[PDB]
Design a binder for this molecule. Structure first.
Ligand SMILES: O=P(O)(O)/C=C/CCSc1ccccc1O
Ligand SMILES: O=P(O)(O)/C=C/CCSc1ccccc1O
Ligand SMILES: *Cc1c(COP(=O)(O)O)cnc(C)c1O
Ligand SMILES: *Cc1c(COP(=O)(O)O)cnc(C)c1O
Ligand code: NA
Ligand code: NA
Lengths: 264, 387, 387, 264
């Protein structure tokens, strides 16, 4: 129960969680393992990791290019799970969540995909293109292998949906800041959803989409959410410093330290 | 939902949570529209006085000479726009308007769906946005220009392989942030429910007209109806009214490209693997690791890298049968119709003609009453066949 | 002759003596055919089940908004082949067959008549020969290819100005030595009798359908019917059934090119001089010494350097009126129909639309029930308008 | 009565008439006047002359090019009538016939065209595109100005036509050897037509189309015709020798002397 422990510890500290996102193997396997270690060393509380897919239909330009850069280095799903195993062998307690598209988990059999996550030490799985109406087999498979199934609560959610999300999910509840796709390009009142989710005893909420500045994470915490996820802002620093690996890491450190400090 | 989203094991609603209310809204507007005689009369007027409905059913006497086969062609090439696609877009555009929408989003590969969406939007006063892969834009200057002349915005997608697949991605990305004012005019009988059901229903009239037509002229139903399958809309449009007539065969034709054996084809239903993508569970062109792949064909219009869920269903229960036809085989049927009947068929439709031609040639003494759906015009393909 | 070869002062039979029996033969076969219900039923079946008859009459609501004009378009662009020319060739091909002929001779400028003759000959099993000026062959690669794909022989004429005129010369030269086995499929309502009369009669159905159509929908006949005039066939096809309805106006539109005043146009009826050529007495594009001259227009299809004798007649007695429309004016109407109605018109037909648009725009408060004959499809002209 | 006198003289000599054709102004005005004089000096009995027209629809390739070469030198109809006047001022008795297309005679008024022919000394006019059914105004105009109207009797003529041709024409009757257009390229039994024409008291017959060799003119005479017309064979010698004017005339002399000898 990686997430449960983290949240109890953070509450104990009256702290919010800062969770950065990156695509595995961007710009290369070796630089990626290095990027992730810098992320943790600078203060990340948990990790959201995507495996390269050919058609990421819920992602904006920045993340579309993250996938493109990983494809250019030949990064495959098998290579990803190898990376995942090594990441856990180095860090035993940090919660790890995978951002997945449906075909990559159905391809080889839904059950076997979740068996692999367990084997490697993955904590949760969010499948971007599966709504609750279609979640049964993914939900059942995750629970069977001690993997937490993550559900998305949109800003336009009705009581029936809130009740559903609260009942099925585990680990954390992905609270969408906005309508649309990923992108630090466009910024995204969620007090009512947070309280209703709290009323139905749902898993602690993590706000995602458009979070790119410190003021944004302190606001998420102030509203009642347990933390915030940031992706495009992280990925943009990688893009900016491709020619200088040393400069990339140094810049990644400054950004995540500042973001982590704002959750306090 | 009000209706079943699956056809056996296939179909579904695999989209991000944010788009689920847009699909429920659409479903409900469609159910209502179908029960409204006012909507029905309006759709029928547009079809008849604007599109050219009903289309002819032509007997092809020269081509079948010397055999025991009687062949008829459903003339969808005579529909306004030169293709069957037009029936669908008129109906979907009226649904968007019934829903209070003022904007249309559309995807296109070779340009045909794009041209159709643009003409329907101009006629019914809707603002049209069209996504096209950069590689296809470069390859399809005439259609891109026709679209712009019709008042539509054309947007090149440079991501991924920069083809149909990637345009399909961009359209949903856009819709997830604009669904409140814009309607997504999907181009084939695929994607998330209710699209496969709606596209079928707004394409039903092809087979419905064919029945009355063959009954009048031959006093009997056909032994089989044949149609090409890129995404599945013209085929299901033809099949639908005949599904309950057990004695009538239903045959769908997928592109074989350079040969199935070379791995250079566009036949996922028969030679692909079932996957989940584009809001659907269906057979798909895919790598071993599950990365989505491109479809290949001499005809640009048969490049949707998957297939409609109702076809995958009709196939599994044995109601319909599916086969494939190679580039050279389609070129041959194209050449033959020009020469013997005075009709230039689209390279897409030529795949269906080619299979009916095989059925004849292989067993010339078999008594057979055949109907091929000529989904479109071939003026489009003159320079391709030339070079 | 059995019928009158003149329409007032215009028409006649100005051909070399050697061809006179071929014209008398044709005349007699036509008179007989018209009285034969068997021929009539056959011509009607081909029209309906092969060509797509009847064509729609579409109300154009967007284009006329804000004015007191109601405009309808006769959809000849939806006919098999994309132009009105098809009606004519089917009938003429049946006449050749009734006469025992097995070969067809044809002339063409932009390629349209050639494509139509080739498709009719392929369908009815006749050997087709087509003459085209070398300058036009170079300029019209797509159509030349379509013709050859349909099994027709295309022959470049390098004599004179190497354009329509010169192809018209070569066709008669050929016929004067082959009339015993070959029939000359003339392409417009001009030339020596009985061609102007026969072409009219096999194009009558355009106006006949338009009457019943407007009567059903409006319960009244139109105030005016408008049509472009290259050689005169689509226009007389529309006019014919309305000639006896004195309250219905008849308006023909000739190409004005760069402006009448520049001398760069294609309007002989109104700005030419009467001469004798191509087996006819009629207005013509001519030099001061009487040397025959070329017609100029943005649309390649309005380049017959003369005009049908029945139009010159209807004009002289005041039954019909003729005007002209410039290149820029036709481009404007083309652009406007694409944008507001979702229909791409031929640049030829755009001349007629442009005049109806003027009639509206110039007097927006005048109550007017108008019908324009949309003789063809404009996919043909996309690159021209583009550059 | 130029033709009448010639025929009486030839009959007196039991001779047939050799009539060559050329296009006025081919390859130039000066060389053309020279060509015509050589033609007469070598033995031509009469002359058939065409004025350049843009669309000669009853002529094959050789004559089509004769018109093209004349157009290249700027030869107009007014220039032609000037040439015609000078030709007559030099040769007072040789019959001269014009080959015309309809527009050139209608253009300026049918009556005025025939008034010009008279003024210049032209003897006959054959309009290639006017059949007997349409000849009235041209016929009436010619007779009014002492110009003989020439009619064409095709090989497929019925009694009604033969009777018509015999009644209306004057000067000579143009007896077509073949179906088709002009051309020495293709050679062309006319005994019945000749006798029927003789029965109806028609003007003496001159056979035209395909005549290019001596044996051909002797055969025409043997059949009962009063002579023969030759065009493409004459025009081909001009075409062949454009670069050498001296050689052109010398070759024209040899050919017409041989052809004239065969009519004896
Ligand atoms: O770039 P952001 O900060 O705007 C959002 C990053 C989210 C990463 S996880 C995620 C979640 C749902 C759908 C797509 C995704 O990629
Ligand atoms: O070249 P030919 O010898 O074959 C015939 C020459 C005839 C000159 S007169 C003529 C007569 C009738 C129609 C056209 C003509 O050009
Ligand atoms: C658009 C297109 C297709 C592809 O078709 P689906 O019916 O949706 O499978 C086929 N034929 C023609 C002529 C087309 O334009
Ligand atoms: C062939 C052509 C014309 C020229 O026409 P006539 O009717 O004979 O004057 C006009 N419009 C179109 C579309 C044509 O193809
Ligand atoms: Na497909
Ligand atoms: Na004209």
């Amino acid at each position: 129960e990686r997430y449960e422990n983290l949240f109890a510890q953070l509450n104990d500290r009256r702290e919010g969680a800062f969770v950065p996102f990156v695509t595995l193997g961007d710009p290369g396997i070796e630089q990626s393992l290095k990027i992730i270690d810098t992320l943790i060393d600078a203060g990340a509380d948990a990790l959201e990791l995507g495996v390269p897919f050919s058609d990421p239909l819920a992602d904006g330009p920045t993340i579309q290019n993250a996938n493109l850069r990983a494809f250019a280095a030949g990064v495959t799903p098998a290579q990803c799970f190898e990376m995942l195993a090594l990441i856990r062998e180095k860090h035993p307690t940090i919660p790890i969540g995978l951002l997945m598209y449906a075909n990559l988990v159905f391809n080889n059999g839904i059950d076997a995909f979740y068996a692999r996550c367990e084997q490697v030490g993955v904590d949760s799985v969010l499948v971007a293109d599966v709504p609750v109406e279609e979640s049964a087999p993914f939900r059942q498979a995750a629970l069977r292998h001690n993997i937490a199934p993550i559900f998305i609560c949109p800003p336009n959610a009705d009581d029936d949906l809130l009740r559903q999300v609260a009942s099925y999910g585990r680990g954390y509840t992905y609270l969408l800041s906005r309508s649309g796709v990923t992108g630090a390009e466009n910024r995204g009142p969620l007090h009512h959803l947070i309280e209703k989710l709290k009323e139905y005893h749902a898993a602690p909420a993590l706000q995602g989409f458009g979070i790119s500045s410190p003021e944004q994470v302190s606001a998420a915490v102030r509203a009642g959410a347990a933390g915030a996820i940031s992706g495009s802002a992280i990925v943009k620093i990688i893009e900016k410093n491709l020619a200088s690996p040393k400069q990339m890491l140094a810049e990644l450190r400054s950004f995540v330290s500042a973001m982590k400090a704002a959750s306090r | 939902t009000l209706l079943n989203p699956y056809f056996g094991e296939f179909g579904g609603m695999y989209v991000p949570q944010i788009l689920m209310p847009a699909l429920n809204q659409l479903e409900e507007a469609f159910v209502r529209a179908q029960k409204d005689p006012e909507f029905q009369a309006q759709f029928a007027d547009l079809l008849k006085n604007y599109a050219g409905r009903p289309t002819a059913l032509t007997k092809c006497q020269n081509i079948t000479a010397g055999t025991r086969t009687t062949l008829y062609l459903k003339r969808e090439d005579l529909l306004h726009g030169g293709a069957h696609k037009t029936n669908q877009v008129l109906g979907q555009a009226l649904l968007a308007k019934r829903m209070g929408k003022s904007e249309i989003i559309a995807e296109t590969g070779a340009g045909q769906h794009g041209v159709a969406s643009a003409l329907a939007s101009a006629l019914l006063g809707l603002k049209c946005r069209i996504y096209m892969g950069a590689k296809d834009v470069e390859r399809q200057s005439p259609n891109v220009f026709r679209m712009r002349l019709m008042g539509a915005e054309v947007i090149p997608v440079h991501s991924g392989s920069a083809t149909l697949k990637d345009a399909c991605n961009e359209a949903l990305r856009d819709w997830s942030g604009s669904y409140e004012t814009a309607h997504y005019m999907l181009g084939t009988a695929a994607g998330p429910h209710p699209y496969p059901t709606i596209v079928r229903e707004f394409q039903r009239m092809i087979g419905e007209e064919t029945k009355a037509q063959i009954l009048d002229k031959e006093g009997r139903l056909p032994d089989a109806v044949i149609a090409c399958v890129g995404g599945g809309s013209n085929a299901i449009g033809m099949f639908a009214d005949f599904i309950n007539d057990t004695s009538v065969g239903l045959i769908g034709v997928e592109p074989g490209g350079h040969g199935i054996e070379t791995g250079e084809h566009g036949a996922p239903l028969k030679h692909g693997r079932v996957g989940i993508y584009f809001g659907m569970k269906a057979p798909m062109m895919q790598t071993a690791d599950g990365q989505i792949e491109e479809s290949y064909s001499i005809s640009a219009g048969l490049d949707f890298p998957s297939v409609g869920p109702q076809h995958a269903y009709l196939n599994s229960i044995g109601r319909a049968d599916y086969v494939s036809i190679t580039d050279d085989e389609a070129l041959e049927a194209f050449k033959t119709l020009c020469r013997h009947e005075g009709i230039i068929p689209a390279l897409e439709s030529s795949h269906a003609l080619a299979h009916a031609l095989k059925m004849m040639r292989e067993q010339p003494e078999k008594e057979q009453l055949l109907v091929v759906n000529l989904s479109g015009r071939g003026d489009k393909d003159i320079f391709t066949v030339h070079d």
